[PDB]
Nucleic acid binder design. Sequence first.
RNA 1: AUUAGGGUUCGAUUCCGGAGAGGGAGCCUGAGAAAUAGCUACCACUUCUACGGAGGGCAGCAGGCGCGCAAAUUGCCCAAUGUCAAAACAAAACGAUGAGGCAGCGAAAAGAAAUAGAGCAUUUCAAUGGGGGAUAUUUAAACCCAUCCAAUAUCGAGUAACAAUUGGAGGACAAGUCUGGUGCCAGCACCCGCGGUAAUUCCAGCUCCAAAAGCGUAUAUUAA
Lengths: 142, 126, 164, 56
Amino acid sequence: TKTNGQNAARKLVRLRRRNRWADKGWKRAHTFAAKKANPFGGSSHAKGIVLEKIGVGAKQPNSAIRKCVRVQLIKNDKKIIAFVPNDGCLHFIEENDEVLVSGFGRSGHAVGDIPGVRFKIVKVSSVGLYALYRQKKEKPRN
Amino acid sequence: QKKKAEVSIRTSQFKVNKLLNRKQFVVEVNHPHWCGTVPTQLIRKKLATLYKVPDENQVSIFGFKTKFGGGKTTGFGLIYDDFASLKRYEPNYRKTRMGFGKPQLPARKSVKERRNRNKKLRGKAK
Amino acid sequence: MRNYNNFNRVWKAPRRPFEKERLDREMKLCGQYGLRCKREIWRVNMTLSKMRRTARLLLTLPENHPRRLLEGSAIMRRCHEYGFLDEEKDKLDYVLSLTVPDILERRLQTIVFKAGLAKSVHHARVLIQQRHIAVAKQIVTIPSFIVRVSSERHIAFADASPFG
Amino acid sequence: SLARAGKVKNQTPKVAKQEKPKQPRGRALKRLKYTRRFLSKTVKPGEKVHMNKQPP
RNA sequence: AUUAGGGUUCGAUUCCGGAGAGGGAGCCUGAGAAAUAGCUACCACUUCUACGGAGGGCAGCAGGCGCGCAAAUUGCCCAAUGUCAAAACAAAACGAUGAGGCAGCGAAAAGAAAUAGAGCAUUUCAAUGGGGGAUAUUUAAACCCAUCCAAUAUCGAGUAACAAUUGGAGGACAAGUCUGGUGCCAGCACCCGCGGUAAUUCCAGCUCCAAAAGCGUAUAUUAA
């Protein structure tokens, strides 16, 4: 039930301001609480430096060791475990390489079977990572 | 070779401008089977005739767009009283096309660098 | 900046990317009218939708309402030209029923094939780009040229073509 | 832990593509696709259409 | 932008209105300024010097560093559009104008539309523009488009080598109970779930599918 009347438009306007905060896909858009914590700080991509190569034992019934990297974001100085997307491609990454990092695609949450890993690498030293895997360009030696 | 390339002319919106001593009209060149474009030199010699203009140069003709896919073109033309009102009333660019120039001064920059160095100087040194 | 030149979309991709009912209906049209791409279908879906939609709005309206007469007759004229509809049909309700073929039948590609200057529709589409077909004295290189019904007498071939 | 990396992709033998003639492009292919499916193929009804099959 | 409707969202950005010229403040001149390519000062930065001094203000256009996921030439010109002005044009005698325009760079978006057509072996009858080039056309000049392969007289495509890609083929979702390789490995997978020795899902080859000079992925947003 709700309230109804010609002159009632305060109650209706107020009652929605109050009840939208109960919503989550947007209790997200309205909290700085979201922005401070998204290590990209709101931006679709970010550049890190590779600190460490890391295996991550896959979750639940799946057994695998997923090829992940630690990353030092150049904007924020924050640290991020990101996923290297494909076969053997961890061979295209060395420590202290600049790396462009993107999200997995469920905005702020991990893609199933990598425990808590929200980000994947799209580029290694300004050369694309899938373009190295699929053989197109040669990783520039520097 | 049905015949030689045949090029005729029709002017459309005709205006007598007595303020500038010129006639104003839109030119239409009907030419079939003219390989390439009709260069202006021929349009002029035709118009100078069709109106019986005593000189060729009194007819100044500028800008042309062909038509897509067939020989016809369209352009503008002017016709003046004799030797004077081309020289006065026509832009310098449309003049040089006739051969009457006023040669372009040094490249615009070079005038600017000099203008500034003179914003320094007083008296007869500038 | 400061350049005011208006541009716009002519087409839209459908929701539900692949339905075997639609895709079937697509190919059956692409091969029949000799079309290059689905894009050229989705186009006559939007020019037909826009057209259709203003037919509803004007139709929901009361008769003799000044928009329904002026703006209503104008959609109902331009569909007699271009021959989307037959000159026998004037209710404005008929605009509200049209189909993708009606606008594709009227496309210069099919008509040059229907007029019989070409083998099917692939000869016709090449034979237009090959610059040989002229509509009336005007060489027209665009397969998608929609042929006004007054102009369906005049096509023949170009005078700069081999054929003249 | 990390040295299993790239096992399978390297371990699978290489066939190095295979030479083939070019296909038609533009609407030409759009015709090649239309001849297959809506022409030359009559079906015993029997409502079914198999785009791929395999020699099982 | 998206929306049946109602709405939800974006609006630094071309037009109007407001504000600022590194930060603050003060003021002169003038019809109009609290002006900054005007002055005075202090702060923070900084450039010359003969050591006494004297300077600077790109949120003008180019361009540099820096920063960042992220953005072009230190280019031509006042031909057009306007402005200021003691000013028409021309005639010895063409005012300035990075406002503005023009091109360069430019798969942000948007329109048109090539990559073959004609009567699986073949075989051959044409046709075309990509491209070349022009008496020229264009333009301020050059570009691009258009027009052109004789008008007395000028190019040319057959493996069309002038060769279309990007993602997929268990389900949602259109398209393989193919063949290799791997053996809960490597990897795929938005979700569900695949891989622990005959894998419809990984890595490959063939085959077909969707869209197509365009096509995946990330984040934001609208419908759902």
